[PDB]
Each structure stands twice: as C-alpha cells, then as structure tokens.
Design a protein around this ligand. Structure first.
Ligand SMILES: CO[C@H]1O[C@H](CO)[C@@H](O)[C@H](O)[C@@H]1O
Ligand SMILES: CO[C@H]1O[C@H](CO)[C@@H](O)[C@H](O)[C@@H]1O
Ligand SMILES: CO[C@H]1O[C@H](CO)[C@@H](O)[C@H](O)[C@@H]1O
Ligand SMILES: CO[C@H]1O[C@H](CO)[C@@H](O)[C@H](O)[C@@H]1O
Ligand SMILES: [Ca+2]
Ligand SMILES: [Ca+2]
Ligand SMILES: [Ca+2]
Ligand SMILES: [Ca+2]
Ligand SMILES: [Ca+2]
Ligand SMILES: [Ca+2]
Ligand SMILES: [Ca+2]
Ligand SMILES: [Ca+2]
Lengths: 113, 113, 113, 113
C-alpha cells in the first residue's frame, strides 16, 4: 500500500516534526498538494530532532517522502484520533536492512490553536 | 480511565517531545518509575516546541503529567505500533473548556538507534 | 475526556461489532444522531461475540454507550486510519475494579463495499 | 514493510474476528508460530462477518495472511493500545485496484477474561 499519504481538513494549520535515528543523512519532505513545503535533513542515532514547522494544509492532500541521497526509503504510516478531536499522523521509514523503521520519522499534529 | 501511563520495555532509550497550543503556561512532566526525569514548560498557540529529550525507560513504567500553575489538566492518550517495531505513545490535554485537547502534548517514540 | 464519541462521514454505511469479556451482562448501544440504532447484550469472559450490524451514519455523529444494569461503565476509545482509507473506531470499557477495560467492547469499521 | 505480523504476549488468549467487503472469496488465515490455527473464508460487500475465534498466542508470534484463490492480497496493519491495557491489532487488505483496503479484514483483541 501507499504509505505517508494523509488527507487533512482543508485550509488548516498543522505541525510537522521530523527526527533521525540513522547513520545516514535523511531527507524528509512534506508535500502539500504535491508541492514540497518543508524539508528536514540530518542524521544521528539518538532521536535527532531535525526541525518542527507549522504549515497550511491547502486542499488537505499531504504526502511525506523520506530518502537518503535520492534513494527513497521504505515508509510505514498511520493516523490516529484522540477524543474525537486531536489528530496525529505518524511516518517511520527504513533506509537499510535492520528493519527498525525509525531512520527518518515525521509526526504531524492538528488542530493547533 | 487513567491516561498518560505507558509500559515501555525496560532499560530502553526513548525520545519524548513536548508542544503547547495554549495561551496558558503548560508544565509537562515525564516520570520514569514515579520520578520526574524531564520537565517542559511554555505557552504558544502554534505548536510551540517546548523541547525534546532522550531518556532511559527504567523498569518501563512511564507516566506523563500535564498541569497549568499546579492544576492538573484533563489527559487523553494512546499507544500505536507500526511495522511491529516502531512505537509512538501520544498524550494530549485540555486545560480549559474548548475541548481541543491540544493544550500540552507529549509524543514519545522508541526504539531509537 | 468524553470517550466513545466519533465523527464519521455523513450518510455512510459502517459496521459495528460488539464483544463481552465479563461476568456481568453488558449493554452496548450504538447511537446515530442521539438515537439508539443497535443494542448488543450479553456476558461471557472469552470474547463472546454479541453481534455485528451495518448501520447508516446519518449526519456522522456516532456515540457508543456501555452499561451494566443501567449503570454506565467507564469508557476508553480511539480512531485509527490505515492506508488513508480504512477506518477503525474502538471502544473498551470497565464495569468494575480490575481495570482490564475489556468488559464491553465495540469495534466500528468503514468504508464498506 | 511486512504487514500483518504482530508480537503478542506469550501463552495469552486472544480473539480474532474476520470480515469481507468484497465480491471475491477471501481466505483469511491466522498463524501462531508459523502454524495456521484458524481460517476464515467468504465474500460479501456489507461487512460480512466470516467468524470469530479465540486462540492461544503460543510464543507470541502471530501472522495474518489474506489471499483470494491462492493469490496474496496487499496488506496494511497496525496495533493500538488503550488505557495501557486493551490491545487491538487490525489488518486490512486489497485484492484488486480500487484501493479500499477493506476486502478481507482481521481484528485481534487481547487480553480476554
Ligand atoms: C549503522 O546503522 C544505523 O544506520 C543505518 C543507516 O542509516 C540504519 O538503517 C540503522 O537502523 C541504524 O540506525
Ligand atoms: C485562549 O484560548 C487558548 O488558550 C486556552 C488556555 O490555555 C486553551 O484551553 C485553548 O484551547 C486555546 O489554546
Ligand atoms: C469476575 O470478573 C469478571 O467480570 C467482571 C464484572 O463483569 C469484570 O469487570 C472483570 O474484568 C472480569 O471480566
Ligand atoms: C466488485 O468490487 C468489489 O469486489 C472487489 C473484488 O473482491 C474488491 O476489490 C472491491 O473493493 C469491491 O469490494
Ligand atoms: Ca534502519
Ligand atoms: Ca535506525
Ligand atoms: Ca483547550
Ligand atoms: Ca488549545
Ligand atoms: Ca473489568
Ligand atoms: Ca473483563
Ligand atoms: Ca478492494
Ligand atoms: Ca472492497
């Protein structure tokens, strides 16, 4: 299945926060309506915080991509809703063979405010 | 039900990252075996990143507390596992009456490496 | 926080399946726009299947209630989305003191077809 | 990523419940330590309940397979934990091209009792 693709409510601010747990440099891109709006880059094996940004969801079509030196990683994702209000969309990824799936991570949350 | 309580694997590094979406100052505490090991403090209504830290899970007993000026907030939480390997534990909280449950948020992830 | 409340897409068929893991008779009600549309009743401590039904979501306002002989149980819930398409909404409940939260369970899934 | 694979606690009873939302006959197998312990078979496009069974988790290694006339479907899965106690493991699958991922579904829950 396609992973890293999420439908958000339209025209809604959301936070996205990216991490590495990898020896290799991760490139984590956040696309809104197929346009890259944020890119997070780095490495480190202890939950290196690569950055956190607030973006508008546009039509609501979000796609997260993770790659290492142009090679796409294998993604896994889901979305969970707490209290029928608080949304998290999580992306992990595997750049190698150990299948820890933590190499490049994105966490999205909404609504803000 | 009790919320914000999670059983992690013992003696395992995990990341915890905290956010505010609130006018009021949030105090987000991370307890490992009933001992506060990290405290994140601040306010802001656009997913203000309060900090991110890596901690050892001790016996595995983790509890997240959120309060505003000593008054405990109402918490909501869960844990989700992707690819039978990548764990996220999420905590939201409500300090008021609008029931957005985003006022003080913690996201935990493991394993690292 | 309120638990057992979910916003579904409007005018959409969904499945709801109920279980007991309890010595006491569970009453599990499914409300659509505040109207009870299904009721599941029974006991048994080995995941007794109480029934499964397909309902229309109406406006999308779903609420699950669980009670034992008229006394509301303590509910816990969330919603998770797989492949940006397949939705599950889960409800557990505690009628007593052992805090297994499995006493009366509802699982909702959509879309069908 | 591998999907449909879950690590349960060892020697623990769990429930598994299977559904179809498909024109084609689904075959949903539940393996415990690589041994098929339950098989659910059928079709129907309105959340047809194919069956529900309680099994022992053995070492804890569970794998769900879904196929149509011997052809493996594309699986998606995750696991979620409520109240730090109630576990659900969900599997959806796609046998075709419409990518509804609802064609053959398994829901596992534990602990029972
Ligand atoms: C050296 O091992 C690490 O780095 C590689 C490459 O990034 C990852 O796949 C792996 O999980 C570890 O984090
Ligand atoms: C002024 O409204 C905001 O601040 C209060 C108090 O922190 C929160 O409960 C609320 O959701 C908003 O974020
Ligand atoms: C006798 O113990 C059982 O029944 C009670 C009452 O229903 C439940 O709370 C409990 O978890 C067990 O399933
Ligand atoms: C005819 O369409 C249905 O049946 C096919 C084959 O099973 C599924 O893939 C599809 O989602 C529908 O449920
Ligand atoms: Ca890896
Ligand atoms: Ca790694
Ligand atoms: Ca609030
Ligand atoms: Ca808020
Ligand atoms: Ca109980
Ligand atoms: Ca019980
Ligand atoms: Ca299909
Ligand atoms: Ca289908």
């Amino acid at each position: 299945a396609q992973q890293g693709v999420f439908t958000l409510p339209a025209n809604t601010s959301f936070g996205v926060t990216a991490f590495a747990n990898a020896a290799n440099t991760q490139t984590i891109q956040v696309l809104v309506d197929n346009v890259v709006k944020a890119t997070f880059t780095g490495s480190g094996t202890s939950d290196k915080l690569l950055g956190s940004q607030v973006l508008n969801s546009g039509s609501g079509a979000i796609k997260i991509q993770v790659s290492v030196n142009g090679k796409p990683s294998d993604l896994v994702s889901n979305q969970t809703i707490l209290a029928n209000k608080l949304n998290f969309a999580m992306v992990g990824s595997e750049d190698g063979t150990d299948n820890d799936y933590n190499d490049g991570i994105a966490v999205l949350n909404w609504p803000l405010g």
